[PDB]
Each structure stands twice: as structure tokens, then as C-alpha cells.
Design a protein around this nucleic acid. Structure first.
Ligand SMILES: O=C(O)CCC(=O)C(=O)O
Ligand SMILES: O=C(O)CCC(=O)C(=O)O
Lengths: 84, 213, 213, 86
DNA sequence: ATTTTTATGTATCAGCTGATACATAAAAAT
DNA sequence: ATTTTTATGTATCAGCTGATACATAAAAAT
């Protein structure tokens, strides 16, 4: 529900926030996954592979589950569930 | 923005302004320049003797075009119709002034290869769209790309920030204007999009993309 | 020259062999290399989970592919199916060993840009073909292109030098195999084409080209 | 109807033969680009030109053939000229 | 502000073409 | 050479969607 636009790539949609570095995926058929850091001196974009972008969210899931709220864990699981 | 940074340094270079509808280059022109759209949209089109138009690619900001000039140079003539579909700002460097500047600054050489590579992927992503049999799937596949390129965040959904005439659409997806107005009317009812003041706003474009995985 | 330059990215660089139908890269394989098809043809395709395969482009000799690796880097993953449509001989340089090779020899940097340009246009020519409504016109437009790239001069007409199944074709122009056989038959009786030894042959392709002005 | 295989732009089809032994060739689909081919021992070099520049080149060849050669050769180029530019 | 030019919504029906199935040939595997 | 997989020829249908016209709204021109 949050969209940022890498200039060569075009619009990207947020998947999860690591904690606040964030992971953004390409809009059409999620072909490329990009790690974005909101540094004060500009946004930075780093592409990563599908297999890898998966485990990175995985860890975040367990962390929402064991330390945080019920709501948030479910929401991320939605995105995860859909994306995979 | 490197593309934008590097082009600027080809003394400096001043930016060209094109008014809506005003043509950049026509077919037959000596293809002697390489362009870099900075802002706005550029409609590349094929035009038959019958007078009909086929939209090849609808470019986005930081998109490199006029690619024919890198092959043959100022010797060969254009065959596509480059129109400023939206008020546009862009640069224009002569191929020759470029060819030399590429060898001088090897940092710029790579910046260009990446930009052309996007176009190949973008142009290829278009193929996928038109390669659909179902005009419904085809329209949407197209609308998805527009959100990716010209789309802006709007609360209900992503609104592409451009105005599209039914025909203009029909010309892009290989169909008639009638069917366009027809299909759009279906997507309104299906409550997947919304139209105000010639602005197309999709709701959860993500969901729509999920179909094609 | 694309053939000359690639052979200098090592000390010598070795030539890969690929058998008929053998796949070069598959969707989800990491893209770590830039490739150069030297001999034969290579079919790039989008493959859905439904199993339906959509041909994005059928590359010819001296064509540069793996364009995604240049911008993405090894990290990202392929979204297309690179299949050896015919027996093929190609080169393969890791992009990292290419970017270093670009700045060392900017003369090669120039050669490449031209190569990618050709790709853009060739992929754009495809847009034209699929942009037709009339499946008849669309098939022909496609066949023309085939004569251009894979065609070999034959006395009656240009014969494409490749083995093409009706499905393989149907996958290329965005239609069903049935409609392919159907239409082909129509062009057989109209005596504009001919199929012998499973190889297609158009008659005076230039005349067909004029219809498409 | 006489063909030549360009590395990049694929098949090219002959238009006419000039007295300099140089020959004018054109792209197979839509006549998008024109080329001047010169056959050196290991030359077979390609020289791109525009349609305007290409028209007049054939124009010269039109006049030469009629005055000093058979009508049919002149007519055969006229066919080509007629179709290719008009 | 009035008019008149362009864009959108709606109506119609005819025909191609996708979907489905089978026959048969050609090819590949065994 | 035997079988069995893949490719091509032909049959059948239903439903888009192209083609044409009209109505209406929106925009541009005056
Ligand atoms: O390169 C040309 O002259 C026509 C096509 C083009 O401009 C492009 O691909 O950007
Ligand atoms: O770069 C890729 O992996 C997919 C597309 C491609 O190979 C190309 O367009 O040449």
C-alpha cells in the first residue's frame, strides 16, 4: 500500500520494513525485488534475488509474531502469502 | 538520474521544450540525434499510407530514444513518428558529438547501455501485453504498465498521471476505439477502475498483476 | 564487429555449444552473464504457470541478449525463457568481467550500443506485427520478418532456414495453433507461400511488403 | 529480386547496378533503409544512405541506360524505380 | 457566453477466431 | 523395423470484437 519509484525501474510497492530499511517489489508481475533505505541524503536502491528476498521477510515474520502485536503479524503474512 | 546528470554535460546543454501534440521528428527525417526524455511522455508511432497509427512504445521520464542514429548515423532516415504526447522536456545530442564523448568518459558509456537495456525490456514487456488473445487481459496488462510508468499515488488507487483518449489507447493495444470504450465500461462496473477528467485510477494494481505470475 | 569484440574478452574466450531445443537460461536462474548468439536462433519466451508459452522475440545471428544482467547485476533473476530454437553457437562473458572490459576498451562500448539498438528496433518491429487486428495481416507481417532474419534465397521465393511448428508460430503472433494451420492453408491456395520438407517459402516477399505501407 | 545478407539488418534486395560496379540494396521489409554495396576482394562493404539520396542515384542510371542501351533494360529499372519511389 | 468540434456512451449484427475434438501424417522413441 | 509421441489437416461451435451508426457529453473554437 506504499509505492516508491526507482527511475529506470518505474513504480515499486512496499513488502515489509526490516527496522527503517524497507523491501520494495516491481509492479508488473513482481519480477525484481529492491532493498530501499530512506537515508536523509536521498533514497538508495539495491536489487536482490527472489529466493533471497524471501528469507529476509521470513525472519521479519517470526519477529512480528514473537515480539509484537497480532494485527501486524497477520498483515505481513497476507503480503507474504500473496507474494509467494 | 545519472543519465540525467551525464546528458547535462554535453559548456552545458540547454533543455528542449515540446508543446502538447507537437512533433519531435517525422518519418523520413535524417536520424542524426539521440534524445533523452527528462519529463513528460513521448509517443513513438508507425504511420501507414492508409493514414492509420500504431503506437510502438509510449516512453517515460529518463528514457533514451532516437536509437536509430547510433547504428547508421545522420545518413539514414526515420520511419517512426515521435510525438510529444504530454508537455515534455528533453535533451538532444548529435550522434557524432556523442560517439567521441563515449570514449572520453567511460562512466557515461555504461550509463547509456543501462538506459537502452531498460527500453529493450520495456519494449519486450509490451510484446507480452499485445501477445494476449483476450482483449480484456490485454487492456489491463497495458494499464498495469501505465501505472508503473506514469502512475501516482491516489487514496483509492494508483491514478496514472496522463490523459488518454480512447483512440489513443486503441492505437496502443491494437484495437478499435469502440471496443475500448466498451471494455472500459466493463471495468467500471466490475469496480476495478475509476475515471474522472480523463484520469484512469486503478484500485490495488498489485491484485491485478497477481494474475500474471 | 560484435563477433570480433566478444572474442577478445578473456586471452581467448571459448564458444559454447547448444543442442536443438536445449535451454540456455530458465526463469528464476540468476542472471550473471551477457550473451552473444553467433550462429542459429534463440527463442526468448514468457512462461505462465498455466504452461502457456509466449514468444517475446526470436533472435537472429549477431544478436545481443542477457540485456537484463547489465542493469540488474548477478543478484536479480531471469523472467524469460531462453531456448535454443535451432542448433546454436554463442559467447558468454560475466557482466562484471564485461563492465571492466567496457572501460578498458571504450571502442567496444560503442559496438555494443549499436547491438542493443538493433534489438530495440527488432523488438519494435514485432510490436508492429502484433499491433494488427487482422490475423491474416499479422501472420504475413511476421513471416516477412522471418524472411528478413532467418530467410535463405530460394528460386521461387525466400525460404526461411528454420524448422517451425504451427504451435511455435502461434505462440509468436499471439494466437492458437488451429488458426495458424487454418490461415496458412488460405495462403497456400492464394499461392503466396509454400511448405516443403517442413520449411516455409514466401513468393516475392517485396510485393507483400508494399501492401504494408 | 537479387539478395544479399547484411549481418545486422538481415536480408537486403537489389535495386540496380551502377557503372562504377557499385550496387544499391534496400531493406526487405518496408524498404526502411538503403545501402550502397562495393565488392572489394575482401570488401563487400556496406554504405548506408537515405531515400532522397538513393532516388537520384537510380535516376542517373535511368538516363544512361535509355540512351546507350536496350529499352528493356531501361524499362526493367523503370519498373523498380516506379515501385520503389512512386 | 454561444457554437461547434471532439470525445465518450450506446446500439447492432456479422463474422472471424478461440475452444474443442478428431483424423491423419510425420517424427521421435523404443 | 515396431510403438508411440508430435505435428498437421479438418470439423464444430460460441462468443467476442470489428464495423457502422447513433446519442450524448466534453472540449475547443468563435
Ligand atoms: O531510432 C529511430 O530513429 C526510431 C526509433 C526510436 O527513435 C527509438 O527506438 O527510440
Ligand atoms: O535479459 C534477460 O534475462 C531477459 C531478456 C533478454 O535476454 C534480452 O532481451 O536480450
Amino acid at each position: 500500500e506504499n509505492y516508491l519509484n526507482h527511475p529506470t525501474f518505474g513504480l515499486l510497492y512496499q513488502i515489509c520494513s526490516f527496522g527503517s530499511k524497507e523491501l520494495f517489489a516491481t509492479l508488473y508481475a513482481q519480477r525484481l525485488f529492491f532493498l530501499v533505505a530512506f537515508d536523509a541524503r536521498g533514497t538508495r536502491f539495491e536489487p536482490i534475488g527472489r529466493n533471497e528476498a524471501r528469507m529476509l521477510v521470513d525472519n521479519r515474520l517470526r519477529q512480528l509474531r514473537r515480539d509484537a502485536s497480532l494485527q501486524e503479524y497477520n498483515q505481513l503474512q497476507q503480503v507474504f502469502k500473496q507474494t509467494f | 538520474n545519472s543519465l540525467l546528470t551525464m546528458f547535462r554535460e554535453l559548456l552545458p546543454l540547454q533543455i528542449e521544450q515540446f508543446e502538447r501534440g507537437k512533433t519531435i521528428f517525422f518519418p523520413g527525417d535524417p536520424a542524426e540525434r539521440v534524445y533523452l526524455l527528462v519529463k513528460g511522455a513521448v509517443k513513438l508511432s508507425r504511420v501507414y499510407e492508409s493514414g492509420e497509427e500504431i503506437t510502438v512504445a509510449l516512453l517515460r521520464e529518463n528514457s533514451v530514444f532516437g536509437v536509430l542514429s547510433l547504428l547508421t548515423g545522420q545518413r539514414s532516415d526515420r520511419f517512426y513518428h515521435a510525438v510529444a504526447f504530454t508537455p515534455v522536456q528533453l535533451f538532444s545530442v548529435p550522434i557524432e558529438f556523442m560517439q567521441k564523448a563515449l570514449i572520453e568518459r567511460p562512466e557515461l558509456a555504461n550509463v547509456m547501455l543501462q538506459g537502452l537495456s531498460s527500453r529493450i525490456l520495456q519494449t519486450e514487456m509490451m510484446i507480452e501485453t499485445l501477445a494476449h488473445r483476450d482483449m480484456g487481459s490485454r487492456l489491463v496488462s497495458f494499464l498495469l504498465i501505465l501505472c508503473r510508468d506514469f502512475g501516482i499515488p491516489s487514496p483509492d488507487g494508483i491514478t496514472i498521471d496522463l490523459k488518454l483518449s480512447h483512440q489513443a489507447i486503441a492505437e496502443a493495444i491494437g484495437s478499435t476505439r469502440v471496443t475500448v470504450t466498451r471494455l472500459l465500461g466493463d471495468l467500471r462496473e466490475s469496480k476495478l477502475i475509476a475515471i474522472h477528467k480523463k484520469r484512469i485510477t486503478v484500485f490495488n494494481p498489485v491484485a491485478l498483476s497477481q494474475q500474471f505470475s
